[PDB]
């Protein structure tokens, strides 16, 4: 029976491949060739944030485009005021091996975790004025690689056990498990309407998940190695991924096909992080060469670079409004560009 | 009237920065160690004789050591291995001797040593269960490592009294198998410190201490162009 089920799976895979070929009338590169290029982009560092001692693994912008949360390997989270560069909080962690963090859209909570397989949720707004742990979420058996906030009572996490999960923060119980990956899950991204999310994994694939049903709606392939970063397009009908093969790819959720490849002969390093600008025209990615390249998302041309790091770039993000891009690296510094 | 809020933020930084400075003193004076080993490795005895991650703290001669043991993580090491790229040392425990467990350990050592992010991290290597190797050999290596048939005891070998020369050859053969990898790939940035220990031995606590010292000393000697 096993050989026949395998043959059936191969037949379905071939049917899917032909179904996708049937829609491949033209590539993106044959349409946007009539669009003027963005030209040279020269961003400059405006502010530098100092205080972490260990390599910084995660950074996330809040919804007011004014506060940042960052996490280093020391066992600390720092809340920063990007405008005045002043610190707001410095939260000690139970363990130093923190790999991800997230800022709640309400500004009330901060989530983080990593090798302890526990997602810790801190309440930043308490009557005593002291930051306290409000919840510890546990169930995941592998390391925690990414956390995202849907609402104050709902959080989406991913772990190294190939399973994503939706947690009910107030009750502390896991409510939805998303399975089907075979490698570690590296990065999550939520849809603008937070009904769908996409999960990239160390399988050279990504999956489009239905937040409400618990069903995996689409599976995307195309990368040659492990996927390290994923980011939804501003419109919500496409996402960009980065992998260890030194290529970045844009996928279309409505055509279930790869749409564009971003690569260069001189780039042989993986892509630690991927992010889009407010208009979706610029794609930014951090590399292992201690820099960041800004790509024209509609042309696959390089628009410019962000150089100012001496160690691996670990994270990148853009403000909701779009006024600034912030990055972090293993140098224990955060920088803001303009 | 907005100056009152700005003043308040300055006060917060003063409180935070002073605390960060205190923490910095604690951070730099603490020596972090990563503990890895074979599935049959006596890691529980490595810890006893000294979730997803466990922490053990030691104070050895007024020096604070922090050892992290990998808990219930997936067998795929290539992603969390990068995180431990700034520890003082990696302690790798391999049991000598059903698959060819030693070849698996050599393959893991190789991959860890040649990792682009671990090029500056030294490895302290413990070879455990010496009595099982000794009994197996005196009671086979050539069926797994044919070159052992032509191996001779190093001229600088210092075996304990009472050891069977066949056992001493097996121990040095295995040690040399690890050392050839370390020597061939190393470029003076990090070193391997192999040791031959017993399943139960409290002396291991000083072996790590002394090795950590030498690692740091040679690091500084490299910096001062003396070594």
């Amino acid at each position, epitope marked *: 029976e096993l050989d026949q089920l*395998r043959q059936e799976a191969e037949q379905l*895979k071939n049917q899917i491949r032909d179904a996708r070929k049937a829609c491949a009338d033209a590539t993106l590169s044959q349409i946007t060739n009539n669009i003027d290029p963005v030209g040279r982009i020269q961003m400059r560092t405006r502010r530098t944030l100092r205080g972490h001692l260990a390599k910084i693994y995660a950074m996330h912008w809040g919804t007011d485009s004014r506060l940042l949360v960052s996490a280093s390997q020391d066992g600390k989270l720092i809340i920063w005021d990007s405008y005045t560069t002043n610190k707001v909080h410095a939260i000690p962690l139970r363990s130093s091996w923190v790999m991800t963090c997230a800022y709640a859209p309400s500004g009330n909570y901060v989530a983080c975790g990593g090798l302890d397989n526990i997602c810790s949720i801190y309440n930043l707004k308490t009557r005593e004025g002291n930051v306290r742990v409000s919840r510890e979420l546990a169930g995941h058996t592998g390391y925690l690689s990414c956390c995202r906030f849907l609402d104050d009572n709902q959080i989406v996490t991913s772990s190294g056990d190939t399973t994503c999960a939706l947690w009910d923060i107030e009750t502390g119980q896991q409510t939805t498990t998303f399975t089907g990956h*075979t*490698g570690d899950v590296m990065s999550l991204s939520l849809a603008p309407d937070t009904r769908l999310f996409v999960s990239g994994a*160390c*399988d*050279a*694939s990504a999956k489009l998940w239905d937040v409400r049903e618990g069903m995996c709606r689409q599976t995307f*392939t*195309g990368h*040659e*190695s*492990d996927i390290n970063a994923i980011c939804f397009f501003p419109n919500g009908n496409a996402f960009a991924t980065g992998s*260890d*093969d*030194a290529t970045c790819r844009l996928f279309d959720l409505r055509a279930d096909q790869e749409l564009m490849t971003y690569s260069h002969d001189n780039i*042989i390093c*993986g892509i630690t992080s991927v992010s889009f600008s407010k208009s979706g025209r610029l794609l930014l990615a951090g590399y292992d060469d201690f820099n960041c390249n800004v790509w024209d998302a509609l042309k696959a041309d390089r628009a410019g670079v962000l150089a100012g790091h001496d160690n691996r770039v670990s994270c990148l993000g853009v403000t909701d409004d779009g006024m600034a891009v912030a990055t972090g690296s293993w140098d224990s510094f955060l920088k803001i560009w303009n | 009237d907005q100056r009152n809020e700005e003043k308040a933020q300055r006060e917060a930084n003063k409180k935070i920065e002073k605390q960060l400075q205190k923490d910095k003193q604690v951070y730099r004076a603490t020596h972090r160690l990563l503990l890895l080993g074979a599935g049959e490795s006596g890691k529980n005895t490595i810890v006893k004789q000294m979730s997803g991650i466990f922490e053990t703290k030691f104070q050895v001669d007024k020096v604070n050591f922090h050892m992290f043991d990998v808990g219930a993580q*997936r*067998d*795929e*090491r*290539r992603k969390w291995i990068q995180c431990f790229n700034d520890v003082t040392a990696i302690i790798f425990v391999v049991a000598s001797s*059903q*698959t*060819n467990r030693l*070849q*698996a350990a050599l*393959k*893991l050592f*190789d*991959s*860890i040593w*040649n*990792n*682009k992010w671990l090029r500056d991290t030294s490895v302290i290597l413990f070879l455990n269960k010496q009595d099982l190797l000794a009994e197996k050999v005196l009671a086979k290596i050539e*069926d*797994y*490592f*044919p*070159e052992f048939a032509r191996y001779t005891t190093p001229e600088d070998a210092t075996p304990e009294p009472g050891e069977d020369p066949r056992v001493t050859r097996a121990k040095y053969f295995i040690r040399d198998e690890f050392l050839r990898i370390s020597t061939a790939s190393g470029d003076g940035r990090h070193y391997c410190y192999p040791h031959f220990t017993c399943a139960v031995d409290t002396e291991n606590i000083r072996r790590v201490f002394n090795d950590c010292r030498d690692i740091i000393q040679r690091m500084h000697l490299r910096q001062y162009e003396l070594l």
Partner: nanobody
Amino acid sequence: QVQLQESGGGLVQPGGSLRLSCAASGFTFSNYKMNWVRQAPGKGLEWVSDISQSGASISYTGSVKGRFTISRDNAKNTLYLQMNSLKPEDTAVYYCARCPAPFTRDCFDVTSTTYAYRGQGTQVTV
């Protein structure tokens, strides 16, 4: 999507030989190190052979030295294995595996848990 499909298996008498193959797709073959691993009927996966991207450096487990050889052809994306002077001890399912990242020399591909870049394997009964 990347695939590895083994071939050239079968049953042979002691002292005989086989030539195994492995077809790869979905990735640039010449940028990755390739390995052969075996699954023993009653034992966990064991590494057998490791060939570098260029074919310049080939490593074998001690138990197969002088009996097994490997090669690769980067113009065909094909990995082979010559299995000579076989004994009952060599009965196993053989798999052709790929190192997880290009342009590197560190590999973790004999994991008990489902490995993403491993083929289905071919049974070599002797």
